[PDB]
């Protein structure tokens, strides 16, 4: 049922309802000659929506807003980017122009600026040390420690037991690390264990790219990371 890379024409955005008031958004980026899927999250909060992550690029993010208006019809009032790379912040300027208040940790904003990427407007306090958590509308934001990037956040929806791992969590079909240029390989397994410790009740786990599963995705990611460490 979950849309896969091949089932989404490039440039389009699909929404997948995970639970009451919780969707993922799925988009594609054809880069270096190959096609990659990417996930973000949408969480209802009363009569408004919280967006987690852009759809990787201005045109994709414009299509995301159009699909949200078409299928859900509630306004996106805030957005959080979970780390500084273009698959999370590319499209922030589109969100800002549409009147969405954009947020990231101060570490993410700084890294995005250094990279020349788009920079969310607001700074999320209370997330600077591993293990820190804060509530943000209908979600909890959690900084597990450095992993895929030093600034990566994860997002938990307590009403639905949905854990969105972003790019710190790999889908099961990804058995090699790929590009990890900004990762902390040494800390990544420890950061994953903090996620497990904090969200042992999670029933759905959404990776940054590809198919959702359960908490098994965490130990799978640790296995991939450790194998890459010993490469
Ligand atoms: O989007 C992916 N990389 C992200 C990325 C790459 C380059 C520049 C910016 C950027 O944000 P990332 O490293 O997540 O930030 C990938 C997704 C998939 C999916 C399946 C198999 C391999 C890959 S590689
Ligand atoms: Zn990244
Ligand atoms: Zn504002
Ligand atoms: Zn990613």
Residue numbers in the entry: 32 to 262
What do the study authors state?
Among the resistance mechanisms, that mediated by metallo-β-lactamases is of particular concern as these bacterial enzymes dismantle most β-lactam antibiotics, which are our widest applied and cheapest to produce antibiotic agents. Mimicking the transition state of β-lactam hydrolysis, they target the Zn ions of the metallo-β-lactamase active site. For further analysis of the binding modes, we co-crystallized 5c, 5d, 5g, and 5j with VIM-2, and determined the structures of the complexes by X-ray diffraction with 1.34–1.92 Å resolution. NMR and X-ray diffraction unambiguously demonstrate that VIM-2 binds the stereodynamic inhibitors with a conserved primary interaction of their phosphonic acid to the Zn ions of the active site.
The crystal structures of 5c and 5d unambiguously show that both, the (R)- and (S)-enantiomers bind to VIM-2. Interestingly, the opposite enantiomer of the same inhibitor is bound rotated by ~180°. Whereas the binding affinities of the inseparable enantiomers of 5a–m cannot be measured independently, the observation that VIM-2 complexes of both enantiomers of 5c-d were obtained when the protein was crystallized from a 1:1 mixture of the enantiomers suggests comparable affinity. Alternatively, a cation-π interaction of the benzothiophene moiety of the inhibitors 5c and 5d with Arg205 (Arg228, BBL34) of VIM-2 is found. The guanidinium moieties of Arg205 (Arg228, BBL34) and the benzothiophene moieties of 5c and 5d are parallel to each other with a shortest distance of about 3.5–3.7 Å in the crystal structures. Common to all inhibitors, we observe the strongest interaction between the phosphonic acid moiety and the Zn ions, with a consistent O-Zn interatomic distance of ~1.9 Å. Hence, 94.5% of the mutations do not significantly weaken the binding of 5c.
